[PDB]
């Protein structure tokens, strides 16, 4: 906490990645919230390039990009539970789907709410459904019967994907489409319950209607 | 070569990342070229998600995304010269600037040639100049007097940035603006000569006018 500070905002899924990873490692830290609508001077100093949260400040050194932050926490506090797979190929696959979720899935998740002003543009709803099917079978292959993407304990892809679960449930209630359930994604449904109930996740996973209130609050 | 195949295209900077990393590790491999304009069925099978090159096929297992590929090669062939820094913070900084070059710099490099049809839209030229200044001082801080971003031998960020040098020189000749030279970027200029002349780079670094011919060939 004296040595570790996290620049972020409570409803941010990427900030949650750092929070979860820090909890897994039992690393204490000070949380500095960003008033959304404007950017703090500390965020500007700490991340002049992207001006984005989260920013992990460890011993007065900035570490930017959530996935890079997760890697860093795992590699520095190496004596704690590993966040990344031990095997090089498992590592590459882990990293691929995390990058996939940020480049493709999450923007397409935002795409359901967004559009223009015609009728039925939401092939976005179809694509989110397809992606979740891709993730469902990805889980089956990676988990191999074990409760998480990373086995016994939550891992890199658990954190990378599970950090979106709140915003997913927001999208579900508003769009009317339940993407993640027992019918469509049976394995992910069971995993989602366990992940959201994990001690390193449950308190930093924001309430759904609370997130929804923020979403509707957002201009 | 029997065990390692690289799906790509010769003028691709991201494919070059894999080629360079493989050379550093002295890992032999078969090269399968993509006819640009269409996508091979192997590329479609090997990368159904992004349908992008490069794809490293190691023991009939696909590894996608160049930076993930670089990580994988470094972590699998771990007995060879390290491509990533040993220190966790140096690792995070390495990864940040690599990600920066792909998200911000290279798209803004393509931005100089691209536009609409008015006059003088190229604040793109200014931004490429600014970014190179950011990279120049980044080099000074990371190299610490040593010839490369990674010290003695080329490293992660050497490969991540140096893979763009051919397309940079193409942009320079066409735009008329020399971005990387002794006046603007003195340290990068000296490094560029060494990197391009490194045995793991020199043969897979395409000729400039040859790249330019491809660029003008490209519709
Ligand atoms: N690639 C970045 C994404 C960061 C990001 O976009 N954060 C959003 C919300 S989670 C934000 O509020 N950024 C400040 C901004 O977008 O201007 C990461 O993984 O850290
Ligand atoms: N993020 C990807 C970028 C891959 C990429 O965009 N490759 C380009 C040229 S280097 C390409 O030809 N992709 C096939 C396509 O864009 O459709 C990586 O680092 O591998």
Strand count of chain A: 4
Give the neighbour order of strands across the main sheet of chain A: 2-1-3-4
The set of bound ligands, ions and cofactors reads:
glutathione
Quaternary status: homodimer
CATH topology of the largest domain in chain A: Glutathione S-transferase Yfyf (Class Pi), Chain A, domain 2
**Number of separate helices of chain A:** 9
End-to-end distance of chain A: 34 Å
Task: Report Rg of chain A.
Answer: 17 Å
The top-level CATH class of the largest domain in chain A is Mainly Alpha
β-strand percent of chain A reads 5-15%
What is the ordering of alpha helices and beta strands of chain A? EHEHEEHHHHHHH
PDB class: transferase
Keywords: transferase, glutathione S-transferase, TAU class, mango, detoxification, reduced glutathione.
Assembly: dimeric
Entry title: Crystallographic structure of the Tau class glutathione S-transferase MiGSTU in complex with reduced glutathione.
Give a brief outline of the structure.
It is classed as transferase. The first copy, chain A, is α+β, with helices and mostly antiparallel strands.
Explained architecture:
The PDB classes it as transferase. The entry lists the keywords transferase, glutathione S-transferase, TAU class, mango, detoxification, reduced glutathione. The assembly is dimeric. Crystallographic structure of the Tau class glutathione S-transferase MiGSTU in complex with reduced glutathione. Chains A, B: TAU class glutathione S-transferase. The organism of A, B is Mangifera indica. Two copies of one chain form a homodimer. Chain A folds into two domains: 1-79, 3-Layer(aba) Sandwich (Glutaredoxin), CATH 3.40.30; 80-219, Glutathione S-transferase Yfyf (Class Pi), Chain A, domain 2 (Up-down Bundle). Chain A has nine helices and four strands. Chain A has 219 residues and is an alpha+beta fold. In chain A, 40% of the residues are buried. The radius of gyration of chain A is 17 Å and the shape is globular. In chain A, helix 4 (88-113) packs parallel to helix 6 (156-162) and helix 4 runs parallel beside helix 7. Helix content of chain A is 53%, strand content 8%. Chain A starts with a strand and ends with a helix. The longest helix of chain A is centred in the middle third of the chain and has 26 residues, at 88-113. Chain A has helices spanning 13-24, 41-46, 66-76, 88-113, 124-143, 156-162, 165-175, 186-197, 208-217; strands spanning 4-8, 30-33, 55-58, 61-64. Chain A has a four-stranded mixed beta sheet with strand order 2-1-3-4. Chains A and B meet through strand 4, helix 3 and helix 4 of A and strand 4, helix 3 and helix 4 of B. Bound molecules: glutathione (2 copies). One glutathione (GSH) binds next to helix 1 and helix 3 of chain A.
